[PDB]
Design a binder for this molecule. Structure first.
Ligand SMILES: C[C@H](CCC(=O)O)[C@H]1CC[C@H]2[C@@H]3CC[C@@H]4C[C@H](O)CC[C@]4(C)[C@H]3C[C@H](O)[C@]12C
Ligand SMILES: C[C@H](CCC(=O)O)[C@H]1CC[C@H]2[C@@H]3CC[C@@H]4C[C@H](O)CC[C@]4(C)[C@H]3C[C@H](O)[C@]12C
Length: 159
C-alpha cells in the first residue's frame, strides 16, 4: 500500500529564486555547497522534463550508496515539482517506489515555505515507521540550509 508523510520547511529566500537554485539546478548547485551529504549527481538520460532520470550518489560511509530519481512533472510557473525515487537503497527491496511532491509558496516577508509530500509505496506488508522517515527530513533540511547560506552570500546567483 501507501504511507503518506508531509512536512514543511521555511526559508528567508524568495520562492522563485529558491525554486530555480534548489530544485531546477539542484543537480549542479547541491554537490557544490553540500559535498558532505551528496558526492555527485549524474544525468542518466533526458533533458529535464518528464522522464528524466538522475543518479544521486552519497558519500562514503552513508547507509545506501545511491538512488535514482525520475522527474514526473515540473510547473515552472507555480513552483511545483514532482519526482519519484525509482531505484536504489530500499527501493526494489521493501519498497516499490517513492513519489514526492515539492511546492514552494511565497510568504509576505519576502521568504518562502516548501511543502513536501512523500508517498511510500510498499512491497507486501512492510511498515514504514514515521520515526524512520525523519532521516529524509533532516537530509532535506541540511541541503536546504546549505543552499540558503550560499544564496544569501551570492546575491547575483540565480537572479
Ligand atoms: C531521495 C531523497 C528523499 C526521498 C524520500 O525519502 O522521500 C531526496 C531528499 C532531498 C533530495 C535532494 C534535494 C536537492 C536536489 C534537487 C534536485 O532536483 C535533484 C538533486 C537533489 C540533490 C535531490 C536528490 C534526492 O532527490 C534527495 C536527496
Ligand atoms: C526510512 C525510509 C524507509 C526504509 C524502509 O521502509 O525500509 C528510507 C526510504 C528512502 C531512504 C532515503 C534514501 C536517500 C538517502 C540515502 C542515504 O544513504 C541515507 C539518507 C537518505 C535520505 C535515506 C533515508 C531513509 O533510509 C529513507 C527515507
Amino acid at each position: 500500500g501507501v504511507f503518506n508523510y508531509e512536512t514543511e520547511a521555511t526559508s528567508v529566500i524568495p520562492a522563485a529564486r529558491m525554486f530555480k537554485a534548489f530544485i531546477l539546478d539542484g543537480d549542479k548547485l547541491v554537490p557544490k555547497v553540500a559535498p558532505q551529504a551528496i558526492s555527485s549527481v549524474e544525468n542518466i538520460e533526458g533533458n529535464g522534463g518528464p522522464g528524466t532520470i538522475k543518479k544521486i550518489n552519497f558519500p562514503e560511509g552513508f547507509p545506501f550508496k545511491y538512488v535514482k530519481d525520475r522527474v514526473d512533472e515540473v510547473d515552472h510557473t507555480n513552483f511545483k515539482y514532482n519526482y519519484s525515487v525509482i531505484e536504489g537503497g530500499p527501493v526494489g527491496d521493501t519498497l516499490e517506489k517513492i513519489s514526492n511532491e515539492i511546492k514552494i509558496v511565497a510568504t509576505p516577508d519576502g521568504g518562502c515555505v516548501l511543502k513536501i509530500s512523500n508517498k511510500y509505496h510498499t512491497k507486501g506488508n512492510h511498515e514504514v515507521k514515521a520515526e524512520q522517515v525523519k532521516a529524509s527530513k533532516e537530509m532535506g533540511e541540511t541541503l536546504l540550509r546549505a543552499v540558503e547560506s550560499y544564496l544569501l552570500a551570492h546575491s547575483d546567483a540565480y537572479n
